[PDB]
Amino acid sequence: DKLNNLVLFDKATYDKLCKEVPNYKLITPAVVSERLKIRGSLARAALQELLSKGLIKLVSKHRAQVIYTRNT
Amino acid sequence: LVIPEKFQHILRVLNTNIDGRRKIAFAITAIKGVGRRYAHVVLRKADIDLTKRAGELTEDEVERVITIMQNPRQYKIPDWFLNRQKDVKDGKYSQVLANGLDNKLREDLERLKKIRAHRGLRHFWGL
Amino acid sequence: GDSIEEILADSRQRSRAWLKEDEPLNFLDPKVAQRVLATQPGGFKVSADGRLIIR
Amino acid sequence: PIKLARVTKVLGRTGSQGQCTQVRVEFMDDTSRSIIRNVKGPVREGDVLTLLESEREARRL
Amino acid sequence: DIKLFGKWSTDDVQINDISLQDYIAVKEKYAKYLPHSAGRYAAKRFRKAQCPIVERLTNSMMMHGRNNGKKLMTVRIVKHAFEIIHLLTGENPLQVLVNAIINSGPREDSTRIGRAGTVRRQAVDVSPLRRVNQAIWLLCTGAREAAFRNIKTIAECLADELINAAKGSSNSYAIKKKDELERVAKSNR
Amino acid sequence: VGPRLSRRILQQARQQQEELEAERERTTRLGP
Amino acid sequence: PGVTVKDVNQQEFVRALAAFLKKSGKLKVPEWVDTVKLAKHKELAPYDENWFYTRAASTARHLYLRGGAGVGSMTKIYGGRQRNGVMPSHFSRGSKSVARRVLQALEGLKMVEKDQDGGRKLTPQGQRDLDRIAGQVAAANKKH
Amino acid sequence: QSVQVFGRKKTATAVAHCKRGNGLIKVNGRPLEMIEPRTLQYKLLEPVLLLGKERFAGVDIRVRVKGGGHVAQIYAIRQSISKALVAYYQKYVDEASKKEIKDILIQYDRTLLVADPRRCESKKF
RNA sequence: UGUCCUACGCCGGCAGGCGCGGGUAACCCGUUGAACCCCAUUCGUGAUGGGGAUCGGGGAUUGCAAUUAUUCCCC
């Protein structure tokens, strides 16, 4: 029915993100938003933050689609 | 980042509810009398980060933005940008927001009904 | 003027040109003007003997 | 069983609206058998078909 | 070596089905840098068998009105689809593309005939050209109607549909519609 | 080619020739 | 040997020139910088708060690429598509006062001057500054 | 020594001048690698990639492009550069290289040297 | 296509206003700097930043005259 995606990081959500996102083999805003039940703009912000800390590898950048994946 | 300890899910301003889980520049537009343009200009005069969400504003921020929307002319918001420019009874420039919009609307309808012009008579004959 | 077809004839606008495209058109070649044109490119009863009937 | 077979001769356009093609088909695994089939789509000489039930031979007037 | 998008090779591309070697044109003469060619592959019959197959996907994602004529968007879509399918699967994207094309084309169709009131269905075979065409159409429809109102983009849904039809798992749209068509063909011999 | 497209091509090539060949007040008095 | 404006990426050049004109800080910023839409076909105010420096950088680049542009030419350049309600869309120009204020601010910085045959055009010193920032773009991008 | 050729598309025209040089490619005074649509960038870059940068290392070209749209201009540009190189290796370089290069272009793409004569149809009352 | 098409300068946030030039025209608008398209930002499945109808206030413009909203602009 009506989705109730979180607008901001909860504590358990942030911890689960930080220790379960960096092993997915495919990192896009859509997959994190759908399987973490979060708003996609904050999904993009979280992915940008994980890229900023040097832990996730960007593959290609676009205005339409951005894709990341694991370092190793 | 993470949720602040004072994140307001529901705001109660101008006798109207605000959904706090939204960007501030549209949670302002959630009430009557303000759309996207006036909300952006109010927030730029108020010097508030528009990237920030609505639910994490402090009491000083909400009281100053409410203050600015009640008296926009004082805060160099121009005359042309306002909702009511020349009130017919008392000529002055203002911005009717929550209940004053409904007040001026229904009293304009009563004024058009009392004088029996075409517009008011047609509007009340429409129902 | 003296061609067969002109003599055997049943008797803004002038600036129009036609290129033609063969080797690629080299404009700097001295012999290029040969490939630039100035004009648009491109009843009796026979008897049984085969002699035509004129009237 | 899935059995594959090549077109040799298209016999013509059949069906009420001309929606099918009657065609002459020989098998590759045994290039002696010959069958007549109806196909949907554009078929020219050399097309190889995959038949799910290669026993019956189709027919239309 | 000619490479799709500068990083995808067509030398290791192996086509499995005997039926479609002349009708899936992606090899050393059909290898191109980009799925855009401005080609007139439809001015004569059977010319589109010489069209490279990524150009056929690119030509078949320009559907439903708004997207007509927008080919650069579609070249972008299939490019991002190739990157994401390579990341998710770990091998050559073009190989599972031709795998999903082979596994998505129906082998036995049904035709509707009728005389007056009586309308019945007769099972008929399919051309290889129609096999490839219907596989392309069903995959494009699967991706398009797969996303349409969700957070997932067009490229992710196209790549997921392409994987799900490459391995032939029943959660794919194209293999479901193909199985339905083959079932009604078997029931209408 | 036809008239219009060839005309555009000819003037374009002429302008390119002049811009390749490319790379003070008027004479107000008669005698120096 | 010196790289020109026409030798680099235009978007990075425009952003670097915007940073240059922002750090100079001597353009005459209008008093109505945060309360206007840039054309009648817009729907919102510009999202980047110091849009004036970006617009002035792009304006300077556009005069470099083609001289003799007045206010009307720059309104034609930044014009777009007005969606007329339930009615068919059309092409609409930009706002004249914004282009005029950008041109007059660039004249006040002495980067841009009039000519005898028409509108605004580039000064030689502003052209030196523009070649300098173009070389900075090429060094920051093509040498990296 | 220099040659001047042209290529075309629906309405887009490209005029290419080919002179002795060192391997810099100019279109409308702008470099080849900066023309706006990157999605068609390899469509702009196919003659160089097929022939190698070593065949362009002793030549320079400047192309003026007028008419058409983005894609039509790109196709006219690639036709122009291919015809310019063919004309140059025909006129001032030996013919065998010109023929083998012409064969390479025409086996990869006929529209690199033969114009597509498709245009919009007219509507009659 | 154009003696109403318009370059340019100044004012106003916009419609618009003032002045001064070209064009009876491949000569000036006009190298017709069109939109889709392309590249970055915000948005995140929400009758929601989709969609704009219908209304309230004010300004401007064409007309002898805009009321039953001529047309345009802003909220």
UniProtKB/Swiss-Prot annotation, chain A:
One of its GO terms (biological process) is rRNA processing. It is found in: Cytoplasm. Keywords: Acetylation, Cytoplasm, Ribonucleoprotein, Ribosomal protein. GO terms for cellular component: cytoplasm; cytosol; cytosolic ribosome; cytosolic small ribosomal subunit; extracellular exosome; nucleolus; nucleoplasm; nucleus. One of its GO terms (molecular function) is structural constituent of ribosome. It comes from the Eukaryota. The modification N6-acetyllysine is found at residues 2, 11, 19, 25, 53. The keyword Transmembrane does not apply. The modification N6-succinyllysine is found at residues 11, 53. The keyword Lipid metabolism does not apply. Belongs to the eukaryotic ribosomal protein eS25 family. Component of the small ribosomal subunit. The ribosome is a large ribonucleoprotein complex responsible for the synthesis of proteins in the cell. Component of the small ribosomal subunit. This is Small ribosomal subunit protein eS25. It comes from Homo sapiens (Human). The chain holds residues 42 to 113 of 125 of the full protein.
UniProtKB/Swiss-Prot annotation, chain B:
Its main location: cytoplasm. GO terms for biological process: cytoplasmic translation; translation. Coiled coil: none annotated. The keyword Cytoplasm applies. The modification N6-acetyllysine is found at residues 92, 104. There is a cross-link at residues 89, 92, 104 (Glycyl lysine isopeptide (Lys-Gly) (interchain with G-Cter in SUMO2)). It is found in: Cytoplasm. GO terms for molecular function: RNA binding; rRNA binding; structural constituent of ribosome. One of its GO terms (cellular component) is cytosol. Keywords: Acetylation, Cytoplasm, Isopeptide bond, Ribonucleoprotein, Ribosomal protein, RNA-binding, rRNA-binding, Ubl conjugation. Component of the small ribosomal subunit. The ribosome is a large ribonucleoprotein complex responsible for the synthesis of proteins in the cell. Component of the small ribosomal subunit. Belongs to the universal ribosomal protein uS13 family. This is Small ribosomal subunit protein uS13. It comes from Homo sapiens (Human). The chain holds residues 3 to 129 of 152 of the full protein.
Swiss-Prot record, chain E:
The gene is RPS5. Coiled coil: none annotated. Belongs to the universal ribosomal protein uS7 family. The modification Phosphoserine is found at residue 127. It comes from Homo sapiens. Gene3D superfamilies: Ribosomal protein S7 domain. The modification N6-acetyllysine is found at residue 32. This is Small ribosomal subunit protein uS7. Its main location: cytoplasm.
Swiss-Prot record, chain H:
GO terms for biological process: cellular response to leukemia inhibitory factor; cytoplasmic translation; maturation of SSU-rRNA from tricistronic rRNA transcript (SSU-rRNA, 5.8S rRNA, LSU-rRNA); ribosomal small subunit biogenesis; rRNA processing; translation. GO terms for molecular function: RNA binding; structural constituent of ribosome. Keywords: Acetylation, Cytoplasm, Nucleus, Phosphoprotein, Ribonucleoprotein, Ribosomal protein. The modification N6-acetyllysine is found at residue 53. It is found in: Cytoplasm; Nucleus, Nucleolus. GO terms for cellular component: cytoplasm; cytosol; cytosolic ribosome; cytosolic small ribosomal subunit; extracellular exosome; focal adhesion; membrane; nucleolus. Component of the small ribosomal subunit. The ribosome is a large ribonucleoprotein complex responsible for the synthesis of proteins in the cell. Part of the small subunit (SSU) processome, first precursor of the small eukaryotic ribosomal subunit. During the assembly of the SSU processome in the nucleolus, many ribosome biogenesis factors, an RNA chaperone and ribosomal proteins associate with the nascent pre-rRNA and work in concert to generate RNA folding, modifications, rearrangements and cleavage as well as targeted degradation of pre-ribosomal RNA by the RNA exosome. Belongs to the universal ribosomal protein uS9 family. This is Small ribosomal subunit protein uS9. The lineage of its organism: Eukaryota, Metazoa, Chordata, Craniata, Vertebrata. The gene is RPS16.
